[PDB]
Amino acid sequence: TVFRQENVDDYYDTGEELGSGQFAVVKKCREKSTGLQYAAKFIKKRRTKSSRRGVSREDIEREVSILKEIQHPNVITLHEVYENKTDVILILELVAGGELFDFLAEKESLTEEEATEFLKQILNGVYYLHSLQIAHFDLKPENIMLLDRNVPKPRIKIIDFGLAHKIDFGNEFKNIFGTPEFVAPEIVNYEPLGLEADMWSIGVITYILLSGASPFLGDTKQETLANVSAVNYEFEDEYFSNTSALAKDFIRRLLVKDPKKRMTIQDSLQHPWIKP
Numbered sequence: 163t164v165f166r167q168e169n170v171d172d173y174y175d176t177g178e179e180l181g182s183g184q185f186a187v188v189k190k191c192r193e194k195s196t197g198l199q200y201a202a203k204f205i206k207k208r209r210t211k212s213s214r215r216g217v218s219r220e221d222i223e224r225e226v227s228i229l230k231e232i233q234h235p236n237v238i239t240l241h242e243v244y245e246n247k248t249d250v251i252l253i254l255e256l257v258a259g260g261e262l263f264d265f266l267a268e269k270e271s272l273t274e275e276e277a278t279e280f281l282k283q284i285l286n287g288v289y290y291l292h293s294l295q296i297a298h299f300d301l302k303p304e305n306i307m308l309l310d311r312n313v314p315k316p317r318i319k320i321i322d323f324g325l326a327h328k329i330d331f332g333n334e335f336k337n338i339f340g341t342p343e344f345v346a347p348e349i350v351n352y353e354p355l356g357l358e359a360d361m362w363s364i365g366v367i368t369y370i371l372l373s374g375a376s377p378f379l380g381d382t383k384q385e386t387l388a389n390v391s392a393v394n395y396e397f398e399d400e401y402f403s404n405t406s407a408l409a410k411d412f413i414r415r416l417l418v419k420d421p422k423k424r425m426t427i428q429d430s431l432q433h434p435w436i437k438p
């Protein structure tokens with residue numbers, strides 16, 4: 163597909179930089195015609211076929227296609243897309259309260275209620291995505307945004323659809339590898355991937371929410387990956403002594419090497435720690 167090729171600056175003004183990654187930069191912006199605000203994600207295009215710099219057009223279009231499908235309170239939506247010779251520019255719903263990553267850094271240790279208030283929202287967004295056969299493949303705290311960080315129980319949206327894929331056969335077997343501390347063993351081992359990989363990441367996020375510590379993190383990325391593949395984690399008493407056994411059970415049933423034995427998103431919502 164092709165996108166709008168008028169100069170995005172004729173239609174929008176940009177402001178604060180909201181975040182970035184290796185091939186993307188995200189700027190707050192305001193649409194001239196409405197005064198409404200958005201997050202403009204500029205993704206750097208590849209300059210040749212054989213290049214490793216920038217993002218392939220196939221990969222950009224996959225992100226756009228998935229984003230166009232989705233509408234749920236706990237996911238961002240896509241407003242418009244522009245392009246020019248250097249970038250594709252996705253005009254995304256603005257999430258103005260910063261990353262979960264930054265919230266957790268700034269705040270004291272969470273209560274079990276605060277952790278489940280965040281988790282339940284994540285679960286609801288993932289339930290929506292998985293119902294659509296969309297695997298996110300990059301769930302982690304920098305990819306979850308708060309609407310407003312100055313309320314007791316902040317509301318969240320999942321962002322960053324740059325690794326998301328439609329799973330129409332039950333698994334996919336493309337080049338997909340995210341961040342060592344969050345990826346499932348099947349990613350580490352270069353196996354076909356499906357919705358189950360997201361459920362593993364949710365286990366890792368839950369462990370972080372409750373404890374402030376990352377379950378598999380080693381001193382190097384190779385150590386982290388080796389730990390993931392071996393399922394080398396434990397609940398440290400120093401961090402988990404006043405956390406319930408049911409919360410640990412929830413995590414334990416997600417951090418399972420065999421994807422067939424791991425809780426599904428439906429299972430997670432019916433688990434006794436979560437189910438009303």
Ligand SMILES: Nc1ncnc2c1ncn2[C@@H]1O[C@H](COP(=O)(O)OP(=O)(O)O)[C@@H](O)[C@H]1O
Nearest residue numbers: 180181182183186188201254255257304322324
């Ligand atoms: N819709 C959004 N609203 C607010 N900030 C955003 C939004 N999308 C992305 N960001 C910020 O920009 C960062 C990078 O965007 P992201 O989509 O995660 O791209 P990357 O694939 O490069 O990680 C995010 O971690 C977040 O800080």
Ligand SMILES: [Mg+2]
Nearest residue numbers: 183304305322
């Ligand atoms: Mg990201």
